[PDB]
Amino acid sequence: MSLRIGVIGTGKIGKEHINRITNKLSGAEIVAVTSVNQEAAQKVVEQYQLNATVYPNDDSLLADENVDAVLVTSWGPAHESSVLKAIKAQKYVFCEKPLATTAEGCMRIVEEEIKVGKRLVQVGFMRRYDSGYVQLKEALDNHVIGEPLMIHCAHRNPTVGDNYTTDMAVVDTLVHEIDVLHWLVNDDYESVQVIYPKKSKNALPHLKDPQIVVIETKGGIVINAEIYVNCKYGYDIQCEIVGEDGIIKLPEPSSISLRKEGRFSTDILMDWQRRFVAAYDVEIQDFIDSIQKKGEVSGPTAWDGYIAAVTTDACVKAQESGQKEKVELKEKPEFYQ
Amino acid sequence: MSLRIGVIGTGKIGKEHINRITNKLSGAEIVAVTSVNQEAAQKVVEQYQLNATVYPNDDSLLADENVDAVLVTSWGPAHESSVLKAIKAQKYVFCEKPLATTAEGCMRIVEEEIKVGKRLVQVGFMRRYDSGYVQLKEALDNHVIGEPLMIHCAHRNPTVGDNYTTDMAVVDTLVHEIDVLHWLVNDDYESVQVIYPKKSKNALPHLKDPQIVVIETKGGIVINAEIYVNCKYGYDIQCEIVGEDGIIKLPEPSSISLRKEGRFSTDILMDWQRRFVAAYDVEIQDFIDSIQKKGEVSGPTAWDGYIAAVTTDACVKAQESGQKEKVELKEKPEFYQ
Amino acid sequence: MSLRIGVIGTGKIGKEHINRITNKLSGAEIVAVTSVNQEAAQKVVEQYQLNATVYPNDDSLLADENVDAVLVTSWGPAHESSVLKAIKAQKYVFCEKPLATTAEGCMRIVEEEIKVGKRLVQVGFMRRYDSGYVQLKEALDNHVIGEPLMIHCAHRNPTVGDNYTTDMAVVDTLVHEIDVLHWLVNDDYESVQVIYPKKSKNALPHLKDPQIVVIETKGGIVINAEIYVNCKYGYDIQCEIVGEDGIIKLPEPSSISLRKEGRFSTDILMDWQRRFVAAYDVEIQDFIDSIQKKGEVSGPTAWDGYIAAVTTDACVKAQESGQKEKVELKEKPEFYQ
Amino acid sequence: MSLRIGVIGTGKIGKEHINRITNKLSGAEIVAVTSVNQEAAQKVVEQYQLNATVYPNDDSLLADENVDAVLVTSWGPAHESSVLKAIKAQKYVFCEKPLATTAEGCMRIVEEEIKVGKRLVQVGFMRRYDSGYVQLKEALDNHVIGEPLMIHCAHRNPTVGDNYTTDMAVVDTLVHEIDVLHWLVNDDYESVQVIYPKKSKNALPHLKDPQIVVIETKGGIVINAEIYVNCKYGYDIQCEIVGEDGIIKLPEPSSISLRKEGRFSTDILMDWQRRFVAAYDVEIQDFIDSIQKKGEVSGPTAWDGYIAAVTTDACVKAQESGQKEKVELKEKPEFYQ
Ligand SMILES: NC(=O)c1ccc[n+]([C@@H]2O[C@H](COP(=O)([O-])OP(=O)(O)OC[C@H]3O[C@@H](n4cnc5c(N)ncnc54)[C@H](OP(=O)(O)O)[C@@H]3O)[C@@H](O)[C@H]2O)c1
Ligand SMILES: NC(=O)c1ccc[n+]([C@@H]2O[C@H](COP(=O)([O-])OP(=O)(O)OC[C@H]3O[C@@H](n4cnc5c(N)ncnc54)[C@H](OP(=O)(O)O)[C@@H]3O)[C@@H](O)[C@H]2O)c1
Ligand SMILES: NC(=O)c1ccc[n+]([C@@H]2O[C@H](COP(=O)([O-])OP(=O)(O)OC[C@H]3O[C@@H](n4cnc5c(N)ncnc54)[C@H](OP(=O)(O)O)[C@@H]3O)[C@@H](O)[C@H]2O)c1
Ligand SMILES: NC(=O)c1ccc[n+]([C@@H]2O[C@H](COP(=O)([O-])OP(=O)(O)OC[C@H]3O[C@@H](n4cnc5c(N)ncnc54)[C@H](OP(=O)(O)O)[C@@H]3O)[C@@H](O)[C@H]2O)c1
């Protein structure tokens, strides 16, 4: 019957996932809430009419035996702590990115989970659940294009706020590409390099934008990723995989077409929140269903969180040094193989 | 909440709706089933692990006061009888097409609903809930192309069985177009004409396929619909609306692209079930949510069912006469505004 | 050496053809011109720096023994006379549409050419030389889609002058479709029907625009053609051929794409003269080349002119009567086989 | 009257140019040819039925006072020689790439031309005359997308023979991109870097294919160019320019579309000779018209040839070293401004 879920962190995306579980998905219910702000957390149970005790902290909510699983949706740097705790409490955990702000912290989560002996942790890299990326994965697995040789991608955003900084280009933005690409081609990153084109007029003086990130896999796949967060025209994810015998490419989001005033056109999304809305529903549903059927989670793993953490670090180092940097990856544990 | 739902008819679409409510959607559960094969209904309850009572018939299912609403997913020609009974028992009813196999059948349902004083009946014309059609209607209502003048559409299917007959081209197939178009442009159908191109080699000698159906609305919009149920290449829905100042067009379903062996290509679906899957989820969720929030349904009405019935009747007439036929619609009751 | 060409009618089209012959194409030169405004004629000679006599009329131009061939680019109604005179003078003739203003006019020209005993007359239906239509013809002749069953096309124009009349929709505009389609599918027209949507706000009150013209071939191919000469958005030619086993479609004219301000777009041409510029070059070059290589022309024939006339007449009839009208088509002389 | 053209080298490209001049274009004729293969040369004169003299060498041909201009279409390394001889004879010269096999060779040509005092040398970089590239240039010069920041391009080929070497990837292939991009964005190259992904199974082991070349301009435009000469699927040129406020992209070559067997598709050329046939006609016609109207040529210059040589040299340097290499360009002479 219903999977009982506690929510750690009721900001925007905590409110979204709650709405999801309460009003859209099957098999689960929100029974507990927290942080930080005792208020607001109470305002959230109000807003959504929840049968939910407002606990004052992780351990508190995590103490409850009427909670089977948790969503960690709080401030990024807070994640590692709550995840560790929930693992010790042996509850299933869905953790929004990042798993932890350091590779060391991801490694600690990895260590703990391996002790429990089964997969409790799923990281919220929703792109793997998007129908376009699923199709790309299927085509590759069915050897449609032969071996992958190169990947060209772009992650574009119309404009960012004052506080968006150069490192966020890789840490908050490219991390999605970083997680999804190694999954697609099943190969590990080896080296990264960052090249800066002239700065766009739309970027604030403190921010280096756009940038080009070149990544090589151990297999020798070269990825060039454009990141351009002040592109003005829209929010835009583009991904092209070049293989030996052919090329596959991610599709545009669905739009009606329009002939009008001398132009034939389709819409480009302006809002990042509309790009992957279905994927978010799918990943949470899969969280719920995996548990109810397999006694463990199925999505991106604690190791995937670690791979991202390490890769983003090398990228930031590449941003600073302007040189080709190594990606320091431990061999993958048997437990995640 | 938990809307408590009884299913009348546990065939293919019945089982798929049961799956949706049980494993995909929010706010409802299946508590009762009935079918003409009572053991078949039992297997379904087994298969989906339902906490549901198997009833011998719809009368007794409708007698169960723990049943809030029903789905009528039985044999087409039997829908009308089940709907009438559900209206008298005052349950909400989601009826798969058709509502009734005759205009008179629909009119009977219409006046029974008007007696009850609120909306009980929602007809399963799922295209209205498809994002493409929603986008088309949004554009229209925002005056993007001015007044609609012409609609060019096509409904294509790879192949049909031995028992698909000429009348089914309009009754089972074009009926989807007939419902969605008058809704899109807010106009009533006035007349229809059927034109037969040479028979396709892919069609059995008793079937006339393809067909062209020309429809004129009262306001003077002209619709040209191509029906070709043996097109071989795929399942394909196309729709273009030509307005005074511009043209809008329904998108292709999402697909990765492929460059390979001298061709740049995307997928065309082979399977009608894959085309509108999301729409079915949305329509049923809307049935549930409208009831739980407004105490009445919100989708295609019994009146839309009537409109479809009158129009397909005129189309069948036109198939046999080769002449322009009037669509004789009674004025729309104030109840259905 | 050069094919020596005289030009009858030195208005807009006459000047453009003179331009391509003088400055773009191989193997010909203008040696004579005539008009009606004997100032503009002398003017064109100087503007294009031509070593050419200006004559006062066709008779005197056709008298000139060093003229090998003529282009008839005069006022529409005057074409027939000049073509006839040229045939009697035994000169080759490229005649801009229309060959004549009546089917009888076209038939007369057909008879004189048969008397001359070889092909002198090429009619300027340039679409057959457009690379997109050439590709459609080639796909059809390679049996890529099976037998053609239906054709859907549109001929759209941003706006017309107040002189444009309802009959001109089929006589001046659809006549291009009428020619190209029977050529593409190698079939004769049998019947036509015209349906009027409500009048567009962009159309003057005396003009019925847009129009839908339904044409059936003897073999049972059904053509649905949309004509909309005040569509505002652009000049647009669309053509989709539905065959038994698949569908082929004319491409958009080439254009860079643009992502900007929330839209992904390509250009739609605003003026008809840019649409087929290459085809005009190819058709004239073919006129020159065929004459020099074979001693007769090879393009659209006087008989093709006749077919267009008879089909347009039947369309004008359908315009007035609102009924299905027969295309009164005489049998094709072996001379044109 | 006619520009009298001599052709040096009657290989494949030489033959094509003779064909367009003799049978397609305006205002010139072939009056002289020479080739290392005498029989081939005389056979070309028969084949195209030329009114031309076969000369045993370029000295003879260039000494012919009835020769106004020459096309140099001989073996690559022999180009420099013929170009210098032609400038000395003060003949107009269309030189197929490369201008010379070294930057030194090009510099000597630059030197001799400046002495003459006018432009005699046009280099055969035809992409500049392609309608797609012209539209890109027009959009950029109208500042449709603001300042260019990044360019992503690809040059792909189905297969190469056993002669093709790693250096030819930049020397014979990328050289087209190298010329067209600095022309598009009006900026000079600064540094280049080469990255090798894993080798394609379609490549002979003596060849490194594919390659990624990264070029920075002095203004800070970053260019990422994929070269892949055994991509199997087709010949394919892609080019996307990312600007501050928008993105413009080269179109696919014109193709009809096809729906068939579960795919919606367009053709991809397999044959490089088909991608740019129109550009070749336009470039040669430009050569002829510029001479006849301005007394000097006006396409890509000897200086453009020199840029290509230096930039290609540095790319080959980067190929061997694996490091970011400098493009050492001298100051552009006033003669070429
Ligand atoms: N998977 C995806 O596609 C996706 C998409 C978006 C976000 N995320 C991730 O989800 C996590 C949380 O995101 P969010 O947008 O929901 O966060 P949020 O609402 O900004 O943060 C959650 C709560 O913490 C408070 N807070 C945290 N740090 C604060 C500070 N320094 N000052 C003031 N209040 C602070 C917030 O208050 P304030 O109102 O003042 O912030 C809010 O009450 C992040 O790790 C983010 O990267 C993932
Ligand atoms: N909205 C849509 O797009 C959509 C899509 C599909 C279907 N539908 C509609 O939903 C309804 C049911 O569809 P379905 O595909 O589930 O149908 P189905 O499985 O073929 O038929 C449903 C039930 O009717 C019975 N039945 C079928 N033919 C019969 C006949 N000739 N005589 C007596 N009983 C008969 C079946 O018996 P058995 O138990 O022996 O099979 C089954 O119990 C139909 O009216 C159909 O038009 C709508
Ligand atoms: N193949 C195609 O796609 C295509 C495209 C465009 C046109 N065409 C055809 O080519 C022909 C010429 O077209 P256009 O646009 O060049 O036409 P135009 O210039 O208007 O007509 C040619 C000349 O006719 C003169 N004229 C007009 N009315 C006259 C009258 N009643 N009596 C005597 N002379 C008269 C005008 O004299 P002034 O010089 O004093 O004005 C004009 O120069 C047309 O029949 C048209 O259908 C074909
Ligand atoms: N703009 C463009 O896109 C483009 C396209 C293609 C080529 N090109 C350029 O045009 C030039 C010639 O190209 P192509 O493909 O036409 O060459 P080709 O036909 O192989 O050679 C052209 C001429 O050089 C001779 N030749 C060829 N190989 C030779 C060798 N190994 N030693 C001595 N003489 C030799 C040929 O005579 P034999 O037959 O007796 O060898 C012929 O007269 C090259 O510089 C090439 O890069 C440019």
Coordinates of C-alpha atoms in Angstrom, one line a residue, chain D residues 20-325:
Chain D
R20 CA 30.1 25.3 -67.4
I21 CA 32.0 27.9 -69.5
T22 CA 31.1 26.2 -72.8
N23 CA 27.5 25.1 -72.0
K24 CA 26.1 27.0 -69.0
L25 CA 27.6 30.4 -68.5
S26 CA 27.7 33.8 -70.3
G27 CA 30.4 35.7 -71.9
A28 CA 33.5 33.5 -72.3
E29 CA 34.9 30.6 -74.3
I30 CA 37.7 28.0 -74.0
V31 CA 40.3 28.8 -76.7
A32 CA 43.3 26.9 -75.4
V33 CA 44.0 23.9 -73.2
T34 CA 47.1 22.2 -71.9
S35 CA 47.8 19.1 -69.7
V36 CA 50.6 16.7 -68.9
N37 CA 48.4 14.2 -70.7
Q38 CA 48.3 15.3 -74.3
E39 CA 45.8 12.7 -75.5
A40 CA 43.4 13.5 -72.6
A41 CA 43.7 17.2 -73.5
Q42 CA 43.0 16.7 -77.2
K43 CA 40.2 14.4 -76.2
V44 CA 38.7 17.1 -74.0
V45 CA 38.7 19.4 -77.0
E46 CA 36.8 16.8 -79.1
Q47 CA 34.5 15.9 -76.2
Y48 CA 33.3 19.4 -75.7
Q49 CA 33.7 20.3 -79.4
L50 CA 35.9 23.3 -78.5
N51 CA 37.3 25.8 -80.9
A52 CA 40.6 25.5 -79.0
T53 CA 44.3 24.7 -79.5
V54 CA 46.0 22.0 -77.4
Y55 CA 49.4 23.3 -76.2
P56 CA 52.2 21.0 -74.9
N57 CA 52.8 23.2 -71.9
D58 CA 51.7 26.3 -69.9
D59 CA 54.5 28.4 -71.4
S60 CA 53.0 28.0 -74.9
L61 CA 49.5 28.6 -73.7
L62 CA 50.4 31.8 -71.7
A63 CA 52.4 33.1 -74.6
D64 CA 49.2 33.0 -76.7
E65 CA 48.0 36.6 -77.2
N66 CA 44.6 35.2 -78.0
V67 CA 44.3 34.0 -74.4
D68 CA 42.8 36.7 -72.1
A69 CA 42.7 34.6 -68.9
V70 CA 43.5 31.2 -67.5
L71 CA 42.1 28.6 -65.1
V72 CA 44.7 26.6 -63.2
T73 CA 43.2 23.2 -62.5
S74 CA 46.4 21.1 -62.6
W75 CA 47.9 18.9 -59.9
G76 CA 48.2 20.9 -56.6
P77 CA 52.0 21.3 -56.4
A78 CA 52.1 22.6 -59.9
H79 CA 49.7 25.5 -59.3
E80 CA 52.3 28.0 -57.9
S81 CA 54.4 27.7 -61.0
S82 CA 51.5 28.4 -63.5
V83 CA 50.1 31.3 -61.4
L84 CA 53.5 33.2 -61.4
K85 CA 53.9 32.6 -65.1
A86 CA 50.4 34.0 -65.7
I87 CA 50.9 37.1 -63.5
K88 CA 54.2 37.8 -65.4
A89 CA 52.2 37.5 -68.7
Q90 CA 49.6 39.7 -67.0
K91 CA 46.8 37.3 -67.6
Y92 CA 43.8 37.0 -65.3
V93 CA 44.1 33.8 -63.2
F94 CA 41.4 31.7 -61.6
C95 CA 43.4 29.2 -59.4
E96 CA 41.7 26.2 -57.9
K97 CA 42.9 25.6 -54.4
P98 CA 45.6 25.6 -53.1
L99 CA 47.2 28.8 -54.3
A100 CA 50.5 27.2 -53.5
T101 CA 51.6 24.3 -51.3
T102 CA 53.5 26.6 -48.9
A103 CA 52.9 30.0 -47.3
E104 CA 56.1 31.0 -49.1
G105 CA 54.7 30.1 -52.4
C106 CA 51.6 32.2 -51.7
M107 CA 53.8 35.1 -50.6
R108 CA 55.7 35.1 -53.9
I109 CA 52.4 35.3 -55.7
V110 CA 51.2 38.1 -53.4
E111 CA 54.5 39.9 -54.2
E112 CA 54.2 39.6 -58.0
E113 CA 50.6 40.7 -58.0
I114 CA 51.2 43.9 -56.0
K115 CA 53.9 44.8 -58.6
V116 CA 51.3 44.5 -61.4
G117 CA 49.1 47.0 -59.5
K118 CA 45.7 45.3 -59.8
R119 CA 44.0 42.0 -58.9
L120 CA 44.6 39.2 -61.4
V121 CA 44.4 36.3 -59.1
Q122 CA 41.1 34.8 -57.9
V123 CA 41.3 31.7 -55.6
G124 CA 38.6 29.0 -56.1
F125 CA 37.1 29.1 -52.6
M126 CA 33.6 28.5 -53.8
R127 CA 31.8 28.3 -50.5
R128 CA 31.7 32.2 -50.4
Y129 CA 29.4 32.0 -53.4
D130 CA 27.1 29.4 -51.9
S131 CA 23.6 30.9 -51.2
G132 CA 23.5 29.5 -47.7
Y133 CA 26.8 31.1 -46.8
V134 CA 25.8 34.3 -48.4
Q135 CA 22.6 34.4 -46.3
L136 CA 24.7 33.8 -43.1
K137 CA 27.0 36.7 -44.1
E138 CA 24.0 39.0 -44.8
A139 CA 22.5 38.1 -41.4
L140 CA 25.8 38.8 -39.6
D141 CA 26.3 42.1 -41.4
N142 CA 22.8 43.2 -40.5
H143 CA 23.7 42.2 -36.9
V144 CA 20.7 39.9 -36.6
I145 CA 22.3 38.0 -33.7
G146 CA 24.6 40.7 -32.3
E147 CA 28.3 39.9 -32.0
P148 CA 29.4 36.4 -33.0
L149 CA 30.9 34.5 -30.1
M150 CA 31.2 30.8 -31.2
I151 CA 31.0 28.8 -34.4
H152 CA 30.3 25.1 -34.5
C153 CA 31.0 23.4 -37.7
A154 CA 31.4 20.0 -39.3
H155 CA 32.9 18.7 -42.5
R156 CA 31.9 15.1 -43.1
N157 CA 32.6 12.6 -45.9
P158 CA 31.4 9.0 -46.5
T159 CA 34.7 7.4 -47.3
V160 CA 38.2 8.2 -48.4
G161 CA 40.7 6.2 -50.4
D162 CA 44.0 4.6 -49.3
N163 CA 46.0 7.8 -50.3
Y164 CA 44.3 10.1 -47.9
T165 CA 46.6 11.1 -45.0
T166 CA 46.1 12.7 -41.6
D167 CA 47.4 16.0 -42.7
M168 CA 45.0 16.1 -45.7
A169 CA 42.2 16.5 -43.1
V170 CA 43.2 20.1 -42.6
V171 CA 45.1 20.7 -45.9
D172 CA 42.5 19.5 -48.4
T173 CA 39.3 19.4 -46.3
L174 CA 39.2 21.9 -43.5
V175 CA 40.9 24.5 -45.7
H176 CA 37.4 25.4 -47.0
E177 CA 36.1 26.1 -43.5
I178 CA 39.4 28.0 -42.8
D179 CA 38.7 30.4 -45.7
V180 CA 35.0 30.8 -45.2
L181 CA 34.9 31.5 -41.5
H182 CA 37.3 34.5 -41.4
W183 CA 35.4 35.9 -44.3
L184 CA 32.1 35.5 -42.5
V185 CA 33.1 37.1 -39.2
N186 CA 35.8 39.5 -40.5
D187 CA 38.4 38.6 -37.8
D188 CA 41.8 37.0 -38.0
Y189 CA 42.9 33.6 -36.6
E190 CA 45.2 33.6 -33.7
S191 CA 45.7 30.0 -32.3
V192 CA 44.7 26.5 -33.2
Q193 CA 44.5 23.2 -31.3
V194 CA 43.7 19.7 -32.5
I195 CA 42.0 16.9 -30.5
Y196 CA 41.8 13.3 -31.6
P197 CA 38.9 11.2 -30.4
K198 CA 39.2 7.4 -30.8
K199 CA 39.6 6.2 -34.4
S200 CA 36.6 5.2 -36.5
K201 CA 36.5 1.5 -37.7
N202 CA 35.9 3.1 -41.1
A203 CA 39.4 4.6 -41.1
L204 CA 42.5 2.9 -42.5
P205 CA 45.0 2.6 -39.6
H206 CA 47.5 5.0 -41.3
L207 CA 44.8 7.7 -40.9
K208 CA 43.6 9.7 -37.9
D209 CA 39.9 10.2 -38.4
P210 CA 37.9 11.9 -37.0
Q211 CA 39.5 15.0 -35.7
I212 CA 38.3 18.0 -33.7
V213 CA 40.0 21.3 -34.5
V214 CA 39.6 24.3 -32.3
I215 CA 40.4 27.8 -33.6
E216 CA 40.4 31.1 -31.7
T217 CA 40.3 34.5 -33.5
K218 CA 42.0 37.7 -32.3
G219 CA 38.6 39.0 -31.4
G220 CA 38.0 36.0 -29.2
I221 CA 35.6 34.0 -31.5
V222 CA 36.0 30.3 -30.7
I223 CA 35.5 27.9 -33.6
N224 CA 35.0 24.1 -33.0
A225 CA 35.3 22.2 -36.2
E226 CA 34.6 18.5 -36.6
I227 CA 36.3 16.7 -39.5
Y228 CA 35.2 13.2 -40.3
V229 CA 36.1 11.8 -43.7
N230 CA 34.9 8.2 -43.2
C231 CA 31.5 8.9 -41.6
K232 CA 29.8 6.5 -44.0
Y233 CA 26.4 8.1 -44.0
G234 CA 27.0 10.9 -46.5
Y235 CA 28.8 14.1 -47.5
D236 CA 27.7 16.7 -44.9
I237 CA 28.6 20.3 -44.2
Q238 CA 27.1 21.9 -41.0
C239 CA 27.8 25.4 -39.7
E240 CA 26.2 27.1 -36.8
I241 CA 27.1 30.6 -35.6
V242 CA 26.2 31.5 -32.0
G243 CA 25.9 35.2 -31.4
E244 CA 25.1 37.3 -28.3
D245 CA 21.4 37.4 -28.9
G246 CA 20.7 34.6 -31.4
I247 CA 21.9 31.7 -33.4
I248 CA 22.1 31.3 -37.2
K249 CA 22.7 28.0 -39.0
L250 CA 23.5 26.9 -42.6
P251 CA 20.5 25.0 -44.2
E252 CA 20.4 21.4 -45.4
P253 CA 20.6 21.1 -49.2
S254 CA 17.1 21.1 -50.7
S255 CA 15.4 17.7 -50.6
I256 CA 11.8 16.5 -51.0
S257 CA 10.7 14.7 -47.8
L258 CA 9.4 11.1 -47.6
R259 CA 7.1 9.3 -45.2
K260 CA 7.7 5.6 -45.6
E261 CA 8.3 2.5 -43.5
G262 CA 8.0 4.2 -40.1
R263 CA 10.4 7.1 -41.1
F264 CA 10.0 10.7 -42.1
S265 CA 13.1 11.5 -44.1
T266 CA 15.0 13.7 -46.5
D267 CA 18.1 12.9 -48.6
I268 CA 21.6 13.5 -47.6
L269 CA 24.0 13.8 -50.5
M270 CA 26.6 11.0 -50.9
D271 CA 28.5 12.9 -53.4
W272 CA 30.7 16.0 -52.6
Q273 CA 30.4 17.3 -56.2
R274 CA 26.6 17.9 -55.7
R275 CA 26.8 20.1 -52.5
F276 CA 28.2 23.1 -54.3
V277 CA 27.5 22.9 -58.0
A278 CA 25.7 26.2 -58.1
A279 CA 28.5 28.0 -56.2
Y280 CA 31.0 26.9 -58.8
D281 CA 28.8 28.3 -61.6
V282 CA 28.4 31.6 -59.7
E283 CA 32.1 31.9 -58.9
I284 CA 33.3 31.4 -62.5
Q285 CA 30.6 33.7 -63.7
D286 CA 31.8 36.2 -61.2
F287 CA 35.4 35.8 -62.5
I288 CA 34.1 36.5 -66.1
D289 CA 31.9 39.4 -65.2
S290 CA 34.4 41.1 -62.9
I291 CA 37.1 41.0 -65.6
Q292 CA 34.8 42.3 -68.3
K293 CA 33.2 45.1 -66.3
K294 CA 36.0 46.2 -63.9
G295 CA 39.2 45.1 -65.6
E296 CA 40.2 43.0 -62.5
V297 CA 39.0 39.9 -60.7
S298 CA 37.1 40.1 -57.4
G299 CA 36.7 36.8 -55.5
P300 CA 38.8 35.5 -52.7
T301 CA 42.3 37.0 -53.2
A302 CA 45.9 35.9 -53.2
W303 CA 46.0 37.2 -49.7
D304 CA 43.1 34.9 -48.8
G305 CA 45.2 32.1 -50.3
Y306 CA 48.1 33.1 -48.0
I307 CA 45.9 33.2 -44.9
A308 CA 44.7 29.6 -45.7
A309 CA 48.3 28.4 -46.2
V310 CA 49.5 29.9 -42.8
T311 CA 46.5 28.7 -40.9
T312 CA 46.6 25.2 -42.4
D313 CA 50.3 25.1 -41.6
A314 CA 49.7 25.8 -38.0
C315 CA 46.9 23.2 -37.9
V316 CA 49.3 20.5 -39.2
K317 CA 51.7 21.7 -36.5
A318 CA 49.0 21.2 -33.9
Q319 CA 48.3 17.8 -35.3
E320 CA 51.8 16.7 -34.5
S321 CA 52.5 18.5 -31.3
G322 CA 49.1 18.1 -29.5
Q323 CA 49.5 21.6 -28.2
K324 CA 47.9 25.0 -28.8
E325 CA 49.8 26.5 -31.8

